[PDB]
C-alpha cells in the first residue's frame, strides 16, 4: 500500500499526513533557500551533488562525509521537515511535491527553485528497476503492470503529466529555473554555468573542472554517502541501487514498439496544452 | 607568562606557535568569509552577535543554542583554526591578529572583513576589569601598572597603536568595512544598515527591529551562550564578566586627570600620520 494524502501516494515509511499538512500550510520558506523540485527518478541526487559541489567550489570534503539525504533533505518527509526548521541558511533541500502540496509560504518568498524534468519513458524505466530492493513500496507483478500504473499516475507522487502541468506556469518567474536531465547530461559544464548564473554565483575554471570531476556517475557510485549504500536494512533488501546506468535513452531497451506507440499517443494527448519545444526528447 | 610569537603576546591557553605560523602561511580564506577584526575589547562579541542575528533575520534560535565562540571562532586559536577548515561556507569568524600575522591567503581573496575600532581609553578600562577573573592571564599589580603596560603595548595582542596602524591602509579596499564601537552604540540601527549594504544584504523593517531587540546589552547578558557563563572553570575564577557596562566614555570614571593628559600626549604622538577624522572621539 501507500500513504494517501490529497489524492497523491506517498511512501508508507517516513511520511505522516499530519506533517504533510504542516509542510503545505505552516512550513516557512526563507528567501535564501535553494530547492530541488523533481518528479521521482528524474536526477534529483545528481543535481543535489552538483549543488553541494558548487557551494564548495569543487571540494568533495562534505559530500564524502555527509549522507546525501542530510545535505539535501526531503522537506515532505518527517525527518526533513524537522531538520530544516533547525538548519541555518543557506538551506539546500529537495521535494517531489506537486505544486499544490508545496509549502504555501514559498509563493510570497524569493526562494530559488530548480525544477528538473526528464523524459518520462526514462523515469518510468528508472523507477521500475529502483523500487525492487525497497522493502516498503508496493511492487508491480510485471513490467507491463508498472507501465500501466505509471501511465495512469497511480504511483508514488502521482502522475508525471500532472506534476509537470502544475509546475510549468512558474517557468516565467525569475526565481524558477527549468532544466532537463537530458541537457544536464549532454553538456554538464554548460548546464552548471546556467545554474551559477541563476543563483548569482561565479566559479573559476579550476573549480568547475573539479565539480565535473566529483559529480561524475562513477564518483557518485563510489561515494558511500551518495550511493544509497548507507540506507538501513529497515528500508531496503540487498543494496542501492540508485546509480544504475546514468544515461538518457535507456527506455528504448525496455519499451516494445507497441508500448512506445501507446505512450507517444498518451504523451501527445496529455501535453497538447503545453509548447512542444519545452521537452528536449525526442 | 604569555606565549610570544613574532613579538606579540598571546594567551597561555588555547594557542601554539606552530598553529599561528600555519594561520599566517597555510590557512585558506574563502571569498565567502565574513571576518571580524578587532583589538580586544573593541566590541568583538557584540559585532559577532549582531552578525549572527543579521544572518537569521532576527531569529534568536541559534544564538541561544550555540556558544558565541563557536558561532564565531577565533581563527588564530587552536580550536578555531581546526574547526574552521571543516566548516562549510558561509563562515563567520573573529580575529585580533595584526595584519602581518593574518592569513596571507586573505590578501588575494574577496573575503569581507569588518574592522571594529574603539576609543583605546575605553578599551584599556574594559580589559583592565575583564582580565581579573581569568586564571591564565598575567595580572597587573595595580590600575597604574596596567595603564603602563597598555601604553607600551606589552599586553595580549600587542600595541593598540600598532594594530590600528597595520589595518588602516585597507580602509580604501572594497572588501573592508571600518566601524567604531562609538557609532555602533550611538546609532545601532543605522550601523546595522551600513553593514547590510556592505555585505550585499537587505533586511525588512521587522527583521532589523528583532536584531536590535536581540543584540541588546541585556539580551546578551541574559543569554547563556553569549555571556561567557559557560567558560570552563579551568579558564576563569567566579564568572563572566564580558558584559560589564556597555557604554562608551567610561574611561573618564577611571583615568586621573594626569593620566588623561599623558594618554592624550601619547595618542597624539602615535596617531599623527593618520587623519584625525578617522577616530570619532573625544
Ligand atoms: C526519510 C527517510 C529517512 C531519511 C533520513 O534518515 O534522514 C528516507 C530514507 C530512504 C528514503 C527513500 C529512498 C527511496 C525513495 C527515493 C525517492 O526519490 C523518494 C521516495 C523514497 C521512497 C525515499 C523517501 C525518504 C526515505 C524513506
Ligand atoms: C580557545 C578557547 C576555547 C574555545 C572553544 O572551546 O571553542 C577560548 C575559551 C575562552 C577564550 C578566551 C576568553 C578571554 C579572552 C577574550 C579575548 O577577546 C581573546 C583572548 C581570550 C583569552 C580568549 C582566547 C580563546 C579562549 C581561551
Ligand atoms: N552522476 C550521475 N550522472 C548521470 N546520472 C545519474 C548520476 N547520478 C544519478 N543518476 C541517475 O539519476 C536517476 C535516479 O534519479 P533520482 O536522483 O531522482 O532518484 C538514475 O537513472 P537511471 O536509473 O536511468 O540510471 C541515476 O542513475
Ligand atoms: N550588546 C552590547 N552593547 C554594548 N556593548 C557590549 C554589548 N555586548 C558586549 N559589549 C561590550 O563590549 C566589550 C567587550 O568587547 P569584546 O567582545 O571585544 O571583548 C565590553 O565593554 P565594557 O567593558 O566597556 O563594558 C562589553 O560590555
From Swiss-Prot, chains A, B:
Residues that bind 3'-phosphoadenylyl sulfate: 41-46, 118, 126, 181, 215, 220, 244-246
The reaction(s) this protein catalyses: an alcohol + 3'-phosphoadenylyl sulfate = an alkyl sulfate + adenosine 3',5'-bisphosphate + H(+); (24S)-hydroxycholesterol + 3'-phosphoadenylyl sulfate = (24S)-hydroxycholesterol 24-sulfate + adenosine 3',5'-bisphosphate + H(+); (24S)-hydroxycholesterol + 3'-phosphoadenylyl sulfate = (24S)-hydroxycholesterol 3-sulfate + adenosine 3',5'-bisphosphate + H(+); (24S)-hydroxycholesterol 24-sulfate + 3'-phosphoadenylyl sulfate = (24S)-hydroxycholesterol 3,24-disulfate + adenosine 3',5'-bisphosphate + H(+)
Primary residence: cytoplasm
Modification after translation: The N-terminus is blocked.
Record keywords, A-Z: Bile acid catabolism, Cytoplasm, Lipid degradation, Lipid metabolism, Phosphoprotein, Steroid metabolism, Transferase
Activity regulation, free text: Subject to substrate inhibition. Alternate orientations for binding of steroid substrates to SULT2A1 may play a role in substrate inhibition.
EC numbers for this chain: 2.8.2.2, 2.8.2.14
One Gene Ontology cellular component: cytosol
Result of altering residue 255 to L: Decreases of the sulfotransferase activity toward DHEA; decreases of the sulfotransferase activity toward pregnenolone and
GO biological process, one term: thyroid hormone metabolic process
Catalytic residues (positions): 96
Pfam families in the record: Sulfotransfer_1
Record note on what altering residue 73 to T does: Decreases of the sulfotransferase activity toward DHEA; decreases of the sulfotransferase activity toward pregnenolone
Residue positions where Phosphoserine is found in the record: 248
InterPro entries given in the database record: P-loop_NTPase (IPR027417), Sulfotransferase_dom (IPR000863)
Function, as annotated: Sulfotransferase that utilizes 3'-phospho-5'-adenylyl sulfate (PAPS) as sulfonate donor to catalyze the sulfonation of steroids and bile acids in the liver and adrenal glands. Mediates the sulfation of a wide range of steroids and sterols, including pregnenolone, androsterone, DHEA, bile acids, cholesterol and as well many xenobiotics that contain alcohol and phenol functional groups. Sulfonation increases the water solubility of most compounds, and therefore their renal excretion, but it can also result in bioactivation to form active metabolites.
Classification via PANTHER family: SULFOTRANSFERASE SULT (PTHR11783)
Subunit structure: Homodimer.
Name this protein carries in UniProt: Sulfotransferase 2A1
Organism: Homo sapiens (Human)
Native organism taxonomy: Eukaryota, Metazoa, Chordata, Craniata, Vertebrata
Amino acid at each position: 500500500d501507500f500513504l494517501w494524502f490529497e489524492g497523491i501516494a506517498f511512501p508508507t515509511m517516513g511520511f505522516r499526513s499530519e506533517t504533510l499538512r504542516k509542510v503545505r500550510d505552516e512550513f516557512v520558506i526563507r528567501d535564501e533557500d535553494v530547492i530541488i523540485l523533481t518528479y521521482p527518478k528524474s536526477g534529483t541526487n545528481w543535481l543535489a551533488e552538483i549543488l553541494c559541489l558548487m557551494h564548495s567550489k569543487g571540494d568533495a570534503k562534505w559530500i564524502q562525509s555527509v549522507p546525501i539525504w542530510e545535505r539535501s533533505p526531503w522537506v515532505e518527509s518527517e525527518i526533513g521537515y524537522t531538520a530544516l526548521s533547525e538548519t541555518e541558511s543557506p538551506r539546500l533541500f529537495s521535494s517531489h511535491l506537486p505544486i499544490q502540496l508545496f509549502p504555501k509560504s514559498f509563493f510570497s518568498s524569493k526562494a530559488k527553485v530548480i525544477y528538473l524534468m526528464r523524459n518520462p519513458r526514462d523515469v518510468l524505466v528508472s523507477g521500475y528497476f529502483f523500487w525492487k530492493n525497497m522493502k516498503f513500496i508496493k511492487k508491480p507483478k510485471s513490467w507491463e503492470e508498472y507501465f500501466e500504473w505509471f501511465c495512469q499516475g497511480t504511483v508514488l507522487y502521482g502522475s508525471w503529466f500532472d506534476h509537470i502541468h502544475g509546475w510549468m506556469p512558474m517557468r516565467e518567474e525569475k526565481n524558477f529555473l527549468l532544466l532537463s536531465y537530458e541537457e544536464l547530461k549532454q553538456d554538464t559544464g554548460r548546464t552548471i554555468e546556467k545554474i551559477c548564473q541563476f543563483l548569482g554565483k561565479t566559479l573559476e575554471p579550476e573549480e568547475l573542472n573539479l565539480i565535473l570531476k566529483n559529480s561524475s556517475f562513477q564518483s557518485m557510485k563510489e561515494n558511500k554517502m551518495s550511493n544509497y549504500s548507507l540506507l538501513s536494512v529497515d528500508y531496503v533488501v540487498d543494496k542501492a541501487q540508485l546509480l544504475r546506468k546514468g544515461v538518457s535513452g535507456d527506455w528504448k531497451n525496455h519499451f516494445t514498439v507497441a508500448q512506445a506507440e501507446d505512450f507517444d499517443k498518451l504523451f501527445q494527448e496529455k501535453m497538447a496544452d503545453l509548447p512542444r519545444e519545452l521537452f528536449p526528447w525526442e
